RNA sequence: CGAUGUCGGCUCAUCACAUCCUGGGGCUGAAGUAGGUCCCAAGGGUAUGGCUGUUCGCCAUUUAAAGUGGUACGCGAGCUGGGUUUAGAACGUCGUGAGACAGUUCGGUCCCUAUCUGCCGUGGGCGCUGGAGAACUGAGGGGGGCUGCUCCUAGUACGAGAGGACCGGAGUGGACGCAUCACUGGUGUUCGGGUUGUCAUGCCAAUGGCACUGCCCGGUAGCUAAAUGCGGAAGAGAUAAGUGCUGAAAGCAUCUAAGCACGAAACUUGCCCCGAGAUGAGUUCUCCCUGACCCUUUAAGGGUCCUGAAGGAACGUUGAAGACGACGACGUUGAUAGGCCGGGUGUGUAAGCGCAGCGAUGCGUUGAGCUAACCGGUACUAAUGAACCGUGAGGCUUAACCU
RNA sequence: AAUUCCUUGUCGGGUAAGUUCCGACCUGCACGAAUGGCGUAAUGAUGGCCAGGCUGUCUCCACCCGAGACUCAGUGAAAU
RNA sequence: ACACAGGUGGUCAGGUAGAGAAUACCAAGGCGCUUGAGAGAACUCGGGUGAAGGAACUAGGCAAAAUGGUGCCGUAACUUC
RNA sequence: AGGACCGAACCGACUAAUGUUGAAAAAUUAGCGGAUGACUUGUGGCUGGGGGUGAAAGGCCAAUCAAACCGGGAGAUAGCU
């Protein structure tokens, strides 16, 4: 027993949606400038799955033109404003990582209504 | 300088707007109570012990009893000895603070590293291996030669051969102090610190920074 | 190097060890007692004790679980029937390790394990 | 392969430095059984410490 | 990592359909570039349209590239592929006019305002 | 020549200094900037490719710098065999020929089961003078030392001018090594899933073997690094080189002679890791032993009873301790290793059930089902005692206390 | 040139840079017309050379896993 | 020479996919391989997996890795056609 | 149809590894080179040492060859160790 829970507390964020990979929510950043903290977002699929609270890494694939560009996020940091579920896919795998290799046909994601 | 006993728990990241992570090593002090101070009579140098923790003493052999029996048998850890320069501190329960690192930053700790049993000829060292294409025999793994033909007839010692790595007392002292809480015994300081989770540490406010 | 990897390795490979040990299994709640050397009467234990707590259940679909593992009729007429009551009062407790000396002549560690409810 | 001369007398003492290896005191007797047991082993009778460990 | 015979495609205008990294030197054993550092570059594919031609060396900086960029809060940028961009070797700049792809924010810190002005979102 | 194996390739040293770089002084045909040169200094650091067997050399380029010699021109019980130097065959060469090539080429062999001196680690022992258990010192021993660009000092000094710098402060990196698992990757047969072929459990579901760990894709727990991060300092003692005053021999002059003050990346320290085999064992704390008889004046030795300490070795549950040992925890004065209970867990909606569709198959039950490694709880399972090894106040001498 | 000593001959092409490679020379101290000279395709376990595919060959090596190393009990060597 | 990493004249041969004395899993049928037991260490013998870059390595893409089936669409220089 | 291409039997060795006090004075593995032919193989016969046999290597002729194996001349000969 440890007390890296009680570490957890002051870090850990309470309004946060639940997801899985597929899923759109539009993140927004103060793009790291230090003076004068504009707020930008970024769209794109989600490709996480966090697996636990604070250990959320939170990858994004960017899509844009139908396919491109990957980043993490990490959705509990300070640079970190929001993120609210805009539509909800459909998986049937972990994390959906083979986004980055097959389109269309062998990637639809759907939204399965389940 | 006075030494504060306590044990590694685990890592976190303290987290910021400006960018930066900020690794923390998570540390949990003893209660470090004191049961000797040096001088007044006999040393000659002013030191302290602070007794660290309690273990079975049940257990406990006399020839250390009758070294804890002015406390009582407690001891747990040790009792580990540090040199109190010009201090008018009293021998039993003078329980040291660690609220002194809200103060000072810059800090001094020392541990034990990773168990690795083996040590490693090459991991010890870290010399490039002789090739493995094309042959290499019983020797794809070690640092080098150790000596050379005909006149020497001898290997030095001082040669970058064999040695001991891992388990090893080692110190850092780059540190720099990002919490302490007194009544939690709660210490978090920049960067990785030697060891794994339950590991032993002592800290000491450092000299430089 | 056995940086944190608990319990034991286990002599022999593998692909061996474990038919030998899903044998030994199926001997085991067939005769109900065993005698092997030291170290494999102490791994006896390992996932045969959650194999009792499993043939102890009646919910739904478990006999999908060590289904490939047992096979024959006068081991499957007992398991996931009748050996559940026997082993379900004692906190676990299903089997009790004891060292058994050396062999005669030989070095090689024995011992004997037991299941606690056996009266046949 | 090489060897510069005989071993002396004093190498296999050098190697074999303990003697017995232990105290080797005399075996434990139990009232279950009418035959002496080694330190944790189990007596005839199934028993040890007036506990039966083993039915027969 | 972006090293010796290291081929890239070339993300500015009437460029070399394929240039090679021939050294990044200047070490103290240096072993590879990350974006916006210097490297020499070699043409091997050219399309000679009055710019460009085969057989010739040059400097460029890598300005997009399969392992990305790393730096801010422990964060992570990927890429998809590799592509370079080639300078003027006694008058600065780029050889030609643009930049092509996502572009990246550790390229913000070049000297000249029209490679740090942007269509793009970074 | 009664065997001491060659060229190139390469992992690896160490000594010398006719010093490559920094550190310091002097001169210039040295205005500044930048070069040339000399003596004085050894600490670290001292680069990559084309052709070629290449050492090399020529060609193509870095760096603060990429110096030179010695060590059987260090480095086949070290590896490699391209080159050299035979077994086949040929071009050029030489002979009538057998045959030959310091010309070329296709090709080609690389043996090692540690006895002992050597080194690294890991235990058992001996010594401090009775024994046990230890600490603090520091005689000593090792490790390190290297570095860019840029800004500010400063377009200030130099200098008609143009060009164009110290000390000093700061910014931002490269290599090198070391330590972590919050971060970021790889890996991950002990686990979840997608799947083809076949076989099997009587049969059909279902589940599982075999086919590279059958393939394909994930991953807790763990390992590690590319990921994360940090540093060789500052101060002090003596002293060369070198800066100097005072001042003789030599009424002058002279840094040396007397006298007085300075000073290096080397030396001594510091710093860090070990350290009293420092037999020079220093000094100190805790624990324990406060027995004697017989024999011969016998102070020189011997035997024997009475009686056992502090502690040690041993059996175990075994580990974040591991080569075995050892070290470490725990043995009911019980969470040491497991189960079990309560869970953490990664995976990705089970099996049975039902319904629809000519069926394949899909849909609803189904945020489903299943788990090792991480954690608390719970004695549910397990963790003898004698005996053994070790004592009984321990050589001399002076002042003193008590007797 | 499987021939050129001195020859990396000298030069174009191929690379950023090419003793080799590709095309020449006419200078074969010394090829040469059945000791044949001249030449081409499938093709050869044929020397060299250029590129892609794939790649731990290389950069910097990491993790995973049988069998051995380790320790036993039995049998138990030898060159020296 | 051996209770020997091997050899020896004649002979047979079913599913399932396939032309299969190919390759996979199995029938009929045999065998669990002639010291055994602990361990589970770097390392060695040998397999499997690998970020990003790729032949930069090396005398030599040497080795390793990948490629690998059938039919149709389609197909050059050179050629003894 | 096939001195074609695939490929098991069979035949044969380009590379890497193992083995040369090794299981063995030629055997082993993994990728294989060939595989109705100038093929390969079971069996017997014929050819003999200064002679055989050889798409012919001082190769092969039973571990052996610029004359093998065995015996005799033989206690060869040695201005030498």
Redesign the pocket.
């Known amino acids: 027993?440890?007390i890296i829970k009680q570490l957890e507390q002051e870090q850990m964020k309470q309004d946060v949606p639940?997801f899985?990979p597929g899923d759109t929510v539009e993140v927004k950043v103060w793009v790291v400038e230090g003076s004068k903290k504009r707020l930008q977002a970024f769209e794109g699929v989600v490709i996480a799955?966090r697996?636990?609270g604070?250990?959320s890494?939170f990858?994004v694939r960017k899509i844009s033109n139908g396919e491109g560009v990957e980043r993490?996020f990490?959705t509990h940091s300070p640079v970190v404003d929001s993120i609210s579920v805009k539509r909800?896919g459909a998986?049937?795998?972990?994390?959906l990582?083979?986004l980055r290799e097959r389109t269309g046909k062998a990637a639809r994601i759907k939204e399965?209504?389940? | 300088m006075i030494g504060l006993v306590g044990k590694?728990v685990?890592?976190?990241?303290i987290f910021t707007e400006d960018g930066v992570?900020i690794?923390v090593?998570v540390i949990e002090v003893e209660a470090n109570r004191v049961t000797q101070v040096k001088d007044l009579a006999?040393?000659g140098?002013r030191?302290i012990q602070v007794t660290t923790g309690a273990?079975?003493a049940?257990?406990v052999?006399?020839?250390?009893?009758?070294?804890f029996?002015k406390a009582g048998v407690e001891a747990g850890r040790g009792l580990w000895?540090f040199?109190l320069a010009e201090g008018e501190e009293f021998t039993v329960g003078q329980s040291i603070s660690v609220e002194l690192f809200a103060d000072v930053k810059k800090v001094?700790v020392?541990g034990?590293?990773?168990?690795?049993?083996?040590?490693?000829?090459?991991?010890?060292?870290?010399?490039?291996?002789?090739?493995?294409?094309?042959?290499?025999?019983?020797?794809?793994?070690?640092?080098?030669?150790?000596?050379?033909?005909?006149?020497?007839?001898?290997?030095?010692?001082?040669?970058?051969?064999?040695?001991?790595?891992?388990?090893?007392?080692?110190?850092v002292?780059?540190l720099d102090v990002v919490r302490v809480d007194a009544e939690r015994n709660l210490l978090l300081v920049?960067?990785?610190?030697?060891?794994?989770?339950?590991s032993d540490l002592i800290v000491k406010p450092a000299?430089?920074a | 190097?056995?940086?944190?990897?608990?319990?034991?390795?286990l002599?022999?490979?593998?692909?061996h060890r474990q038919?030998m040990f899903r044998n030994m299994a199926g001997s085991l709640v067939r005769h109900e007692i065993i005698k092997t050397?030291?170290?494999?009467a102490?791994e006896l234990?390992?996932?045969v004790?959650?194999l009792?707590?499993?043939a102890k259940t009646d919910?739904?679909?478990?006999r999908?679980?060590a289904?490939?593992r047992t096979?024959d009729?006068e081991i499957v007429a007992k398991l996931f029937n009748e050996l559940g009551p026997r082993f379900a009062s004692?906190?676990?407790?299903?089997?009790?390790?004891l060292?058994c000396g050396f062999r005669a002549?030989?070095?090689?560690?024995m011992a004997y394990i037991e299941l606690?409810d056996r009266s046949e | 392969?090489?060897?510069?001369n005989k071993?002396t007398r004093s190498?296999r003492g050098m190697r074999r430095?303990?003697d017995a290896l232990?105290?080797v005191?005399?075996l434990?007797?139990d009232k279950t059984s009418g035959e002496k047991?080694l330190?944790?082993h189990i007596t005839a009778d199934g028993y040890?410490?007036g506990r039966k460990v083993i039915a027969k | 990592?972006?090293?010796?015979?290291?081929?890239?495609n070339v993300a500015d205008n009437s460029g070399a359909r394929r240039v090679?990294?021939?050294?990044v030197?200047?070490?103290?054993?240096?072993?590879?570039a990350?974006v916006g550092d210097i490297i020499?570059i070699?043409?091997?594919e050219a399309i000679p349209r009055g710019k460009v031609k085969?057989?010739?060396?040059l400097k460029a900086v890598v300005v997009r590239?399969?392992?990305g960029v790393?730096?801010p809060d422990?964060?992570?940028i990927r890429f998809d592929?590799?592509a370079c961009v080639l300078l003027n070797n006694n008058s600065e700049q780029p050889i030609g006019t643009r930049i092509f792809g996502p572009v990246t924010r550790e390229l913000r810190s070049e000297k000249f305002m029209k490679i740090i002005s942007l269509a793009p979102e970074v």
């Open positions: 027993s440890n639940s899985r799955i697996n636990r604070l250990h890494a990858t993490v990490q909800r998986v049937r795998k972990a994390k990582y083979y399965r209504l389940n | 590694k685990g890592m976190t990241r992570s690794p090593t006999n040393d140098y030191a273990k079975k049940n257990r052999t006399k020839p250390e009893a009758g070294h029996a000895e040199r001094d020392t034990t590293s990773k168990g690795k049993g083996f040590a490693g000829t090459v991991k010890r060292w870290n010399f490039r291996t002789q090739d493995a294409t094309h042959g290499n025999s019983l020797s794809h793994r070690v640092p080098g030669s150790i000596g050379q033909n005909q006149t020497p007839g001898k290997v030095f010692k001082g040669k970058k051969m064999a040695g001991q790595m891992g388990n090893e007392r080692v110190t002292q780059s920049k960067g990785a610190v030697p060891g794994a989770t339950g000299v430089k | 190097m056995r940086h944190r990897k608990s319990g034991r390795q002599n022999r490979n593998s692909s038919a050397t030291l170290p494999k102490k234990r390992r996932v004790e959650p009792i707590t499993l919910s739904v679909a478990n999908r679980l289904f490939a096979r009729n004692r906190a676990g407790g299903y089997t009790r390790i060292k002549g030989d070095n090689a560690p606690v | 392969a090489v060897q510069q071993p190498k430095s303990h232990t105290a005191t005399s434990s007797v047991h330190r944790h040890y410490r | 990592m972006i090293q010796e015979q290291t081929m890239l090679m990294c021939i050294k030197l200047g070490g103290s054993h240096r072993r590879y990350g020499k070699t043409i091997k085969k057989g010739d060396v590239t399969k392992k790393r730096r422990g964060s992570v592929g590799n």
